[PDB]
Amino acid sequence: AGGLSQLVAYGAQDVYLTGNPQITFFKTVYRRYTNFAIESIQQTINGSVGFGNKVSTQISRNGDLITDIVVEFVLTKGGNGGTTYYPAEELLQDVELEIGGQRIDKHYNDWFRTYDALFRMNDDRYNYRRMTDWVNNELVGAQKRFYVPLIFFFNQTPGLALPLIALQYHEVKLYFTLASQVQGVNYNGSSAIAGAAQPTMSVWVDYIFLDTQERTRFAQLPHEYLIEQLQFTGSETATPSATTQASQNIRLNFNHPTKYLAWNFNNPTNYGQYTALANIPGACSGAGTAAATVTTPDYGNTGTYNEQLAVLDSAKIQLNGQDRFATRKGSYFNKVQPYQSIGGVTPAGVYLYSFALKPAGRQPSGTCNFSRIDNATLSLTYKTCSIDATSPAAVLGNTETVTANTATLLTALNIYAKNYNVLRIMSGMGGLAYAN
């Protein structure tokens, strides 16, 4: 009986599972670690803080290693419930990372929205929203402290920590661009909100201090860290109103090994709107009643999952004039690829194609090297914007090849590439090994 009965039941098949045992699951031995301590320190922000302003921080050698960096804002909401959508993420228009004046990376507000859309998962997205938004139906006049963790190569795991010890000659500096327009905070649509306050900004850096022998080694030894970088420039697309399903050949100007290519289509006037608006719940201000206007979103519900309001019908990538795969429908890139590669859920309007088996991991697992690819092209086909957005009978009752007449507003095309580099630090100076 019991477990012993299972054990005495053994046979030919078993050798492949338990013969000449190598591990026992019940004798884990933990490895001893070099001592360290973690503390949070506030950095100096050089420059005037406000809407449309650009500020920066020269990060002090307060500790031995730098890892996680969190930018916080204190905002007062100028609207009521549903009027904001990641106001701290929109505000943080971009963050540029330099070591010794050499650009290591630069992330944009839309990338942060895409990153959340693709790689954040497991209720982290909800907590993330809590850090970047008003999520409890708060009213006009509410004040909230927001946190926007940065997602550079050394932010997400201690194993990629950036040595401060080994950089005696090069400073580490971050540049911040603060959006001129944040929905529900100083603008409601295109209209200014009178009396809106300027943000209070602070940048917090978490420092790690090492013990005696370890910090000695860090000063003496060279360092090579695996670097994550973002490649981005924006472009315009063409979304048709009728009779045609338009094609566009967009040149992919990238020069590194990558984990993946990711892209979206957005209304440039509404931060995070990647779908058409329609008179259905969550996809229109006033949805469901006569006040519904499909030109203005129910901002707080901007991110939806029905790909029917997404503009992309199909996509193909060509590398050196050769098809990389047979054309796939947009749903493949919105749902299927991130399923098998990330294991998360991607909202409608955001798409990814991976080159890696595990693009969410630190461990490299397959890359496409665009330093040896000439004319790489992303070929996009749009679905016909023929559905009357104000009639639910049509909005949720049509074919795969059509979408709403309001999808034509999604004129901004954002194609991101997530690549590799190596950060080499030797003799007090840092720099990238690959600069193409």
Partner 1 sequence: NFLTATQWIGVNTQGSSLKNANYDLRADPIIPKADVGPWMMSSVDPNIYQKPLF
Partner 2 sequence: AFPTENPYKLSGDFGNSTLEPTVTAALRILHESPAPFNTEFFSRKNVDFIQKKLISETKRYTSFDIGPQNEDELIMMMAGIYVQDSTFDGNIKAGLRKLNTLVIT
Partner 3 sequence: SDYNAPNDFMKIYYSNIVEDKKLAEKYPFFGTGPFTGLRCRKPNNVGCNTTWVSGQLVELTPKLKEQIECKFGIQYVK
- Which element (helix H / strand E) includes 215? helix 212-220
| Residue whose entry in the numeric block shows the structure tokens 């045992």 | 21
> Going by C-beta distance under 8 Å and a sequence separation of 6 or more, which residues neighbour residue 11?
none
Q: Sign of torsion, CA 151 155 158 164?
A: positive
Q: Which does 426 bind (CB under 5 to 8 A by kind): partner 3, partner 2, a second copy, none?
A: none
Q: How far apart are CA 235 and CA 378, in angstroms?
A: 12
Binding of partner 1 by 46 (CB under 8 A): no
Binding of partner 1 by 8 (CB under 8 A): yes
Binding of partner 1 by 170 (CB under 8 A): yes
Closest distance to partner 1 from the beta carbon of 163 (Å): 11
Residues 137-166 that bind partner 1 (CB under 8 A): 165-166
Binding of partner 2 by 27 (CB under 8 A): yes
Q: Which does 138 bind (CB under 5 to 8 A by kind): a second copy, partner 1, partner 2, none?
A: a second copy
Binding of partner 2 by 15 (CB under 8 A): yes
Q: For residue 128, how many other CB atoms are within 10 A of its CB? A: 19
Closest distance to partner 2 from the beta carbon of 303 (Å): 38
Q: Contact 204/70 with Cβ under 8 angstroms?
A: yes
Q: Which is nearer to partner 1, 233 or 436 (CB)?
A: 436
Q: Contact 120/278 with Cβ under 8 angstroms?
A: no
Near partner 1 by CB under 8 A: residue from 1, 17, 194, 326: 1
Closest distance to partner 1 from the beta carbon of 321 (Å): 5
Binding of partner 1 by 222 (CB under 8 A): yes
DSSP assignment string, 188-205: ETTEE-TTPPPPEEEEEE
Q: How many residues bind partner 1 (CB under 8 A)?
A: 53
Q: How far apart are CA 67 and CA 299, in angstroms?
A: 33
Q: How far apart are CA 133 and CA 113, in angstroms?
A: 13
Near partner 1 by CB under 8 A: residue from 168, 235, 247, 399: 168
Near partner 2 by CB under 8 A: residue from 136, 213, 340, 436: 213
The DSSP secondary-structure symbol of 183 reads B
Closest distance to a second copy from the beta carbon of 378 (Å): 14
| Nearest in space to 165 (alpha carbons), one of 208, 122, 106, 194 | 208
- For residue 351, what are its two tokens? 């798409």
Binding of partner 2 by 101 (CB under 8 A): no
Binding of partner 1 by 64 (CB under 8 A): yes
**Which residues contribute to the site for partner 3 (CB under 8 A)?**
214, 217, 221-224
Near partner 1 by CB under 8 A: residue from 113, 144, 215, 418: 215
Closest distance to partner 3 from the beta carbon of 102 (Å): 20
The count of C-alpha atoms lying within 13 angstroms of the C-alpha of 347, restricted to the half-sphere facing its C-beta, is 22
| Nearest in space to 154 (alpha carbons), one of 228, 231, 71 | 228
Binding of partner 2 by 214 (CB under 8 A): yes
Window of 95-103, 282-290, 339-347, 387-395 that interacts with partner 1 by CB under 8 A: 95-103
| Nearest in space to 276 (alpha carbons), one of 239, 250, 314 | 239
Q: For residue 281, how many other CB atoms are within 10 A of its CB? A: 12
- Which element (helix H / strand E) includes 369? strand 368-369
Closest distance to a second copy from the beta carbon of 108 (Å): 20
Please give the residue ranges that form the binding site for partner 1 (CB under 8 A): 1-2, 4-5, 7-13, 60-64, 100-102, 165-166, 168-171, 209, 212, 215-216, 219-222, 320-322, 371-374, 422, 424, 426-436
